[PDB]
Design a protein around this ligand. Structure first.
Ligand code: HEM
Ligand SMILES: CC[C@H]1[C@@H]2C=C[C@@H]3[C@H]4C/C=C\C(=O)NCCC[C@@H]5NC(=O)/C(=C(O)/C=C/[C@@H]4C[C@@H]3[C@H]2C[C@H]1C)C5=O
Length: 390
């Protein structure tokens, strides 16, 4: 069994994935838990994500392949399949739908401008990670959920604990307990003090309409907050890094910003974001895949970043092509667990790029590229700091 995940080298795709796609699904050994099959070929990853025989509900209570000593538990979206998953996801679908996040575009741009203001007042160099990439999406998801602004820093502390693959399990357990107690309290707060936020609407669904249990309500609230805190914070930094090291792309995006959506989709395809955050499904029946047979009860993991460079699906897959047309990337997943945050994340990435490139037409690295440091032993690829001048 191949040790997994591979040690990250920046945002580079590990060269071993090229050979992996051309063979049968490989046996992998994670740091803890069951061994598993690893699927990398685009068609094979799509099959795992669409075939109901590969189940996240079946993973609960198993010795899951994972990065941490203790296995995940829960009642929410990452733990269920239809029809239970559907009842939960329908309650969040309105707020995360493209139609309902689009009105946030102006607020997101105002926030970006405010953050860029503070970078200007503070003087060069700025750090795009601490000064922009972290605050912008964390603020937004807090506003959508109805999380009070004063708790930003406390919640980012928790996010840093979750983001480290190396967090000692006692600390992870005590901060975990306190985070859940905090969210229990917020759910009480939104029932006494309703608002036009998602957690208020989810509290109604639980405690007035009996549509979800208290366990399901708390699971969804915690899942949505954590995912919102750890995903786009790192991805914004990664996209600015790739744009800065491909400067020949910046003048088109600055002058003709209607080109930014397609570039965001290409960068979504290209960038390996999630590493330690990888869901393991368990097969509920025997399944033939890639010339091998995945037995009932065995575990399967996917590598979306590898599938996203499969030469049968993408022309010139190893090149960053910012106007790429045929781009059916799996950067947000597929099937019933397709990223519920995709429209919000997309909007944030688009706005970040539009605002920063307009406000800072001379933006460039403030250190040599060799002096950049990537986060180590993280669950998500990202930079520790991104020093820029302008
Ligand atoms: C660029 C940022 C993001 C990327 C690359 C990303 C990626 C993904 C991927 C690949 C999956 C599918 C995983 C699988 O099926 O194994 C997924 C699911 C999910 N993501 Fe996103 N995500 C991002 C941002 C977000 C945001 C902002 C939120 C919440 C506000 C979010 C919440 C979720 C949830 C709750 C699911 C599970 C949905 C379900 O099971 O029904 N993600 N994400
Ligand atoms: C952006 C999309 C991401 C998404 C973002 C955040 C979530 C991840 C972080 C949540 C909790 C956390 O780490 N610690 C608290 C208890 C530790 C316990 N021990 C584990 O092993 C374990 C997990 O593995 C959890 C994985 C969660 C899957 C979620 C991720 C799925 C991806 C597609 C536990 O919950």
């Amino acid at each position: 069994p191949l040790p997994y995940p591979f040690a990250p080298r920046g945002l580079d795709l590990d060269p071993a994935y090229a050979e992996l796609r051309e063979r049968a699904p490989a046996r992998i050994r994670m740091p803890y838990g069951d061994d598993a099959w690893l699927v990398t070929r685009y068609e094979d990853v799509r099959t795992v994500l669409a075939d109901p025989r590969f189940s996240l509900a079946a993973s609960m209570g198993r010795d899951q392949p994972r990065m941490r000593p203790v296995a995940r538990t829960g009642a929410g979206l990452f733990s269920t399949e239809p029809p239970e998953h559907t009842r939960l996801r329908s309650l969040v679908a309105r707020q995360f739908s493209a139609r309902r996040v689009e009105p946030l575009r102006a607020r997101a741009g105002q926030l970006a401008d405010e953050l860029i203001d503070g970078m200007v007042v503070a003087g060069q160099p700025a750090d795009l990670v601490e000064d922009f990439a972290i605050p912008m999406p964390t603020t937004i998801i807090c506003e959508v959920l109805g999380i009070p602004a004063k708790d930003h820093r406390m919640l980012w502390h928790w996010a840093e604990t979750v983001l480290s693959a190396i967090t000692p399990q006692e600390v992870l357990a005590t901060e975990g307990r306190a985070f859940v107690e905090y969210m229990v309290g917020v759910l009480e707060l939104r029932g006494r003090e309703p608002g036009d936020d998602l957690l208020t609407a989810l509290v109604r669904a639980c405690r007035e309409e009996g549509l979800i249990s208290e366990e399901e309500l708390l699971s969804i609230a915690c899942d949505l907050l954590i995912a919102g805190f750890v995903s786009t914070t790192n991805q914004i930094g990664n996209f600015f890094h790739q744009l800065l090291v491909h400067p020949e792309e910046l003048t088109r995006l600055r002058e003709r910003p209607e080109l930014i959506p397609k570039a965001v989709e290409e960068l979504m395809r290209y960038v390996p974001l999630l590493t330690g955050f990888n869901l393991a499904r368990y097969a509920t029946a025997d399944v033939e895949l890639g010339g091998i047979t995945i037995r009932a009860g065995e575990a399967v993991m996917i590598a979306t970043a590898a599938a996203n460079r499969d030469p049968e699906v993408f022309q010139e897959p190893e090149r960053l092509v910012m106007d790429r047309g045929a781009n059916p990337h799996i950067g947000f997943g597929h099937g019933v667990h397709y990223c519920v945050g995709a429209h919000l994340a997309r909007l944030e990435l688009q706005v970040a790029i539009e605002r920063v490139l307009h406000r800072l037409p001379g933006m460039r690295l403030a250190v040599p590229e060799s002096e950049l440091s990537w986060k180590q032993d993280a669950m998500v690829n990202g930079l520790q700091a991104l020093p820029v001048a302008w």
